[PDB]
Amino acid sequence: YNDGYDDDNYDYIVKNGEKWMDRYEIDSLIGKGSFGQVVKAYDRVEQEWVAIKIIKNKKAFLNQAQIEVRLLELMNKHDTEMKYYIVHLKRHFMFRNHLCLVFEMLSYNLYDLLRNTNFRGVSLNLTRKFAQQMCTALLFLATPELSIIHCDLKPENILLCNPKRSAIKIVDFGSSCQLGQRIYQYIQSRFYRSPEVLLGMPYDLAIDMWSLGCILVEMHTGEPLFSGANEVDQMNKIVEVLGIPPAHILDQAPKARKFFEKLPDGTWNLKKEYKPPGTRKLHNILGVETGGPGGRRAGESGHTVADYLKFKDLILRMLDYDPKTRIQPYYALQHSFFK
Ligand SMILES: Cc1nc2ccc(-c3ccnc(N)c3)nc2n1-c1ccc(N2CCN(C)CC2)c(F)c1
Prior knowledge:
This protein is of the alpha+beta class. The protein folds into two domains: 2-104, Orthogonal Bundle (Transferase(Phosphotransferase), domain 1); 110-338, Transferase(Phosphotransferase), domain 1, CATH 1.10.510. The chain has helices at residues 59-78, 110-116, 124-141, 195-198, 206-221, 231-242, 247-250, 256-259, 282-285, 305-318, 329-334; strands at residues 19-20, 24-33, 36-43, 48-55, 89-95, 98-104, 148-149, 158-160, 168-170, 177-178, 260-262, 268-270. Helix 3 (124-141) packs antiparallel against helix 5 (206-221) and helix 5 (206-221) runs antiparallel to helix 10 (305-318). It starts with 18 loop residues before the first strand and ends in a 5-residue tail after the last helix. The structure holds ligand XIR. It is classed as ligase/ligase inhibitor.
């Protein structure tokens, strides 16, 4: 293990108080993920805490992180005032056989926020703040010179900047790509995976908007909207809410028959118990008329029927099966939900 320094998962074994390169004092592990670890460090030179993503000493992670660095640096050539809600990569270096990405220090991810609500959700008002930021972030990523598809939006990859404000940033561009790259497939985290990707179809930046629609519902209900145990269960759970996808899409989907078959009348239906297609209404998931998710927002300011109907509309537009008509970031931002 790399001159001593690695565990059996090819992680750097953090030693609290270690100094690196006469510059960073490692304080502690913040958290682990697939890619490796994020540690809290003090940068003596800039005099600030930084979150150092220490990539596993494994080629696949190293290579993914090099793609991440490239995309972050590209995003940086634009967002120098850090306006657009993407985590700032300060610098990167190889250290003891681990690629290290030095980020600004942020705070809890939105999953952990949901965990602190006991998976019962945050307010629609907070949901709206997250939504507005996330739509602005997507707006940014879709700037032509970037055209970046995050490809793994989920609550864990959206972080509070700090524990007392509603400001957030997107993290983790390990799985990201630019438009026209199509080599990736079975991409996105399953709960947040777009129909086009489930269907093995060409995809674009609209996949991120699908993920966001899923995320926003979850932020408010506390629970994943579409919590499939596998792709088939995923598509089924999607269909429960949204109905059979448009025929014009299914006729074009290489993986149509993973999920669907044509009936003798030439129409598409599921292969296989679930609520029948389109019968699990978002109207009811959100509790539009019944005091919000599980009735728990009954009375609360900012949780009116009118508010929920606006939120539902926005969400349904994000969860358009058709990536061509799925609401784009700009128009999402103009939605009545945000007035
Ligand atoms: C607190 C904190 N600030 C961070 C800044 C950047 C990143 C990051 C992580 C991954 N990819 C990129 N591009 C940036 N992470 C930051 N974190 C942070 C927050 C929470 C966790 N976890 C991970 C999972 N665990 C179960 C809960 C806490 C973390 F590792 C880092």
